[PDB]
Structure 1
Amino acid sequence: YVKLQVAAGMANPSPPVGPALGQQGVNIMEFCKAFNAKTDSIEKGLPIPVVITVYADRSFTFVTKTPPAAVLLKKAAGIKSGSGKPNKDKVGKISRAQLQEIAQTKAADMTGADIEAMTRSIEGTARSMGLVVE
């Protein structure tokens, strides 16, 4: 019953994911191959969040989610890391459509009842990372 943000297809048995599943007991290489086979369609290099569901018989199923908004905002602005001092140092610029584009994909993981509400969550996400909206 663990939640991870492993890479798009770079699901190594490496320490980023390796020891996490070990305490439960699921086969490490089994999950790594299963995750990659369905995330090949995902754009390259994305920390797609997956929630693992392990059982008592040492079996597991997992569900993948849309990429995090902060990741989507980082690629939308063409940057790699956020502002060190958000709302003090400004490190990018994205249009409202770029907010709509990110909101639409994350709408599968949002909770707002409208595109405007979903956007405002993304707008709040943008301010918290120093990315101003332009």
Structure 2
Amino acid sequence: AYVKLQVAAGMANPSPPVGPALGQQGVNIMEFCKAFNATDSIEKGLPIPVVITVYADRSFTFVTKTPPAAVLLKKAAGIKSGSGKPNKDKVGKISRAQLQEIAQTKAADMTGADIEAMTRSIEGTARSMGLVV
């Protein structure tokens, strides 16, 4: 039962948003919250995903990973929404140097050895976002 369901690391105890979605299983809500908070290592306020392999003994194994490139593009742009009709009117612009900086920060967990290929994947994500390089 491994489906990633998580919120930003700043808001501990996700009682409104996820809640029963992280707690169908017998693993406790408080256990999930303390495992998510155990967050404090790097930064808070940004969504940090995690793979949750739940066993029969309710001692789940969790493997954390890097924050999504979408909200990282948001932090690079400094804007909130950039998807509403981008072709009819361009909403934002990201530097390719900034995208390569994002790629070399994301080179840890992102599946790829070619940094330029991961970069051009990232401005693929950026054109899908709507912001034109």
**TM tier, shorter chain?**
0.7 to 0.9
Aligned-residue offset at 1:97? 1.7
What's the counterpart of residue 61 of structure 1? 61
**Deviation for aligned residue 1:110:** 2.0
Alignment identity in percent?
100
Q: Tell me the TM-score normalised to structure 1 length.
A: 0.87
Q: How far off is 1:69 after superposition?
A: 0.5
Whether the 8 Å CA contact 2:5–2:21 is kept in 1: the answer is: no
User: For residues 91 and 41 of structure 1, what CA distance do their matches in structure 2 show?
Assistant: 34
Q: Which shifted more, 119-128 or 40-49?
A: 40-49
Cα deviations by residue, 1:2-43 (Å, 9 ceiling, x for unpaired): 212421131324132210232111011112122112x12333
Q: Which structure has more strand as a fraction of its residues?
A: 1
Tell me the SS of whatever aligns to 1:4.
Answer: coil
Encode CA deviations 1:79-127: one digit per residue, 9 max, x unaligned.
1223212433322222112101211222223223311101011010000
Contact 1:88–1:130 at 8 Å: present in 2 too?
A: no
- SS of alignment partner, residue 119 of structure 2: helix
Q: Does the C-alpha gap of structure 1 residues 117 and 8 become closer, same or farther in structure 2, counting only changes over 3 Å?
A: same
User: Which is worse superposed, 114-123 or 50-59?
Assistant: 50-59
Question: Aligned partners of 2:29, 2:61: CA distance in 1, in Å?
Answer: 13
TM-score, scaled relative to structure 2: 0.88
Aligned residues of 2:92 and 2:132 also touching (Cα < 8 A): yes
Q: Structure 2 regions of 5+ residues with no counterpart?
A: none
Q: Paired residue for 2:33? A: 32
Distance 2:45 2:22 in 1: 22
Tell me, in whole angstroms, the C-alpha distance in 1 between the residues paired with 2:61 and 2:54.
7
SS in 1 for 2:22: helix
Moved more, 79-88 or 94-103: 79-88
Structure 2: distance between partners of 1:4 and 1:83: 23
Cα pair distance change 1:10/1:120, threshold 3 Å? same
- C-alpha separation between the residues in 2 aligned to 1:23 and 1:83? 33
Q: Distance in 2 between matches of 1:14 and 1:62?
A: 20
Contact 1:6 1:50 in 2 (8 A): no
Report the equivalent of 2:15: 14
